[PDB]
Design a protein around this ligand. Structure first.
Ligand SMILES: *CCC(=O)N1Cc2nc(-c3cccc(C#Cc4ncccn4)c3)n(-c3ccncc3)c2C1
Length: 273
């Protein structure tokens, strides 16, 4: 179910960019009983980052591979793992990067059907992890990769559990008492949708991370995006509720956004449709 990878099976050729708690590389894969050299994406995680031993990390990474079966078209399967001095994670090399970059670079050229479709896709993958009882703990436009412009897939799930902080994305219970539930991921989904609807703007721009906790208590939220009708922004605002059970469910989000995709011009006001 989970491929254990020898150091000679792969080699991190180029670097894609550095992460907050590690570095992301572009590499190759010459498997055990295979002679081809498959291009892969390798995630080297910094040493002593995870407060677990390699055998504890291994057994926990076995369930993040159980997710890969029966699978989901909007969930990133992990190809293999390298548990040596550091934790290295192999996945397919997606040449079109994250949706955070896609919306920032394509801002003008992006349509309304696209954003609502992406919002259904992100909720479709998150509902799958809810049903397979995995809690992402870090969902944002950065951890959602563009396979093709109409196919986004969520990556970096369970990684936060694997180690031991995105303040501007966490639900208030996660910030205050480190409580991560399936409903805390719905707060992140709302923030993630706010990122798409604001062409990659940084949430709470200006406000320090330390401040956010009190800002959410004063009932202040991310503003209504200049394309979002009150209808859509209300879905977003509902995700950011204080009582976690009161926030929408991922089944309900798929449903509400699927309805909006039928007539995207009614729910999103972009110049070009
Ligand atoms: C758009 C740039 C950005 O912010 N990105 C964040 C990011 N991370 C990764 C990535 C690299 C290597 C491995 C993984 C993984 C995983 C995983 N963990 C648990 C369960 C399932 N999968 C994630 N990428 C990335 C870059 C290029 N190709 C693929 C992924 C990005 C992009």
């Amino acid at each position: 179910l989970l491929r254990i990878l020898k150091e000679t099976e792969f080699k991190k050729i180029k670097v894609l960019g550095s992460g907050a708690f590690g570095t992301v590389y572009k590499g190759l894969w010459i498997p055990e009983g295979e002679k081809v050299k498959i291009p892969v994406a390798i995630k080297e995680l910094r040493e002593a980052t995870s407060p677990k031993a390699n055998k504890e990390i291994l057994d926990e990474a076995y369930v993040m591979a159980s997710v890969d079966n029966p699978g989901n078209p909007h969930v990133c399967r992990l190809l293999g793992i390298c548990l040596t001095s550091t934790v290295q994670l192999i996945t397919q090399l997606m040449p079109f990067g994250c949706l955070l970059d896609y919306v920032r670079e394509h801002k003008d050229n992006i349509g309304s059907q696209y954003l609502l479709n992406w919002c259904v896709q992100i909720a479709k993958g998150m509902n799958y992890l809810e049903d397979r009882r995995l809690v992402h703990r870090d969902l944002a436009a950065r951890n959602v990769l563009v396979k093709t412009p109409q196919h986004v897939k969520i990556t970096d799930f369970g990684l936060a559990k694997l180690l031991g902080v995105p303040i501007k994305w966490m639900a208030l219970e996660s910030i205050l008492h480190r409580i991560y539930t399936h409903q805390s991921d719905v707060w992140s989904y709302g923030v993630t949708v706010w990122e798409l609807m604001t062409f990659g703007s940084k949430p709470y721009d200006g406000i320090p991370a330390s401040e956010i906790s009190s800002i959410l208590e004063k009932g202040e939220r991310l503003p209504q995006p200049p394309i979002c009708t009150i209808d859509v922004y209300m879905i977003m605002r509902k995700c950011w509720m204080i009582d976690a059970d009161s926030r929408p469910k991922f089944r309900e989000l798929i449903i509400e956004f699927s309805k909006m995709a039928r007539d995207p011009q009614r729910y999103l006001v972009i110049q070009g449709d």
